[PDB]
């Protein structure tokens, strides 16, 4: 029960030059928001969404993949805990998606996930990192939609 105090050093943990510290801070804040619901928690979650959105344009592909693979369930839990953030998250997701839409078309692939736009989700191996990131984005959006609709 003494985990809420960790919020007081969650932003300080974000402003770190190491990507692992930032990912861990984002995940810890995600769990704290899915556990505790406070206006301060909402402010820290908004700051985390902002610092995640500003890190999309200052990271290379090899770092973008490793930074945005674990941190998408964090956005899912942020949506589950804070309704008013929905739009922002969606916008953010869209941006990231479009970035991936430009990363897959750059180099030739083996599965070609571009034509898979007209596909549906099926309830419920070794691939390309960009294709894996696209699939992770799609899956997290599906979970967000299923949580908000139900």
């Amino acid at each position: 029960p003494s985990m809420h105090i960790c919020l007081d050093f969650i932003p300080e943990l974000i402003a770190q030059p190491e990507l692992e510290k930032q990912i861990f801070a984002i995940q810890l804040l995600s769990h704290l928001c899915i556990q505790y619901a406070l206006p301060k928690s909402l402010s820290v979650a908004r700051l985390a969404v902002n610092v995640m959105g500003t890190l999309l344009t200052v990271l290379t592909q090899a770092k973008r993949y490793a930074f945005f693979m674990p941190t998408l369930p964090s956005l899912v839990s942020f949506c589950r805990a804070f309704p008013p953030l929905y739009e922002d998250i969606m916008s953010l997701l869209i941006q990231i998606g479009q970035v991936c839409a430009s990363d897959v078309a750059t180099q030739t692939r083996d599965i070609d996930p571009i034509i898979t736009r007209l596909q549906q989700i099926k309830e419920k191996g070794s691939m390309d990192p960009d294709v894996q990131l696209c699939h992770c984005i799609e899956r997290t959006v599906i979970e967000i939609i299923n949580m908000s609709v139900s």
């Binding site: 619901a37 406070l38 206006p39 909402l42 805990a81 804070f82 309704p83 008013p84």
Partner: protein, 222 residues
Amino acid sequence: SGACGAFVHGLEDEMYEVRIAAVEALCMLAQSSPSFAEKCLDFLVDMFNDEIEEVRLQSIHTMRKISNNITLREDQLDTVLAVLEDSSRDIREALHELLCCTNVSTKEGIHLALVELLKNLTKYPTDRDSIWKCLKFLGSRHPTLVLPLVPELLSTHPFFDTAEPDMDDPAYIAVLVLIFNAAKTCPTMPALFSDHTFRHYAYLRDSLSHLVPALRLPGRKL
């Protein structure tokens, strides 16, 4: 064949010793005949600004004796303001007994009466028992009229669940007991409750039973 008045011309004519007899005849004729009340309640309400300590209590009495098959939509402000103009130590209990046995048309009158009782509580905390009893009677009379007002009385948030009020606050226990008394015949009362409302009901029910009734909450037992 009737070609006279003495009903709308016999009130504001002379000293109140005849006004008392007039309102006595009025309540005596309204008790027997079930009709005639919908057209005399306006006249019985608008006679409150009489600046006389005698006509006020008599108006409370004649309204309490006719508190049946009557409505109240906008005539409440002219009959409730008798507690702010002066102390009226012996008239306040009569006014509270009147306000609880009557019926309210819409929820606006309920909200007005509630905020006025909260003002009387925060200004005069020496008669909290009468306030709790009148709120109990009001909740037992018509519990539906407060259903669209449950999330508006207590401070609740759909995704925050914070700002817990004080336990021993004489301002929140009144709303709590009113909700608990209106929770008797409501189909889905705990659908809009907060997290601490269940434990507040569990504590108030086991401490006192003359104001908080028994419910069927899923958290509680028996």
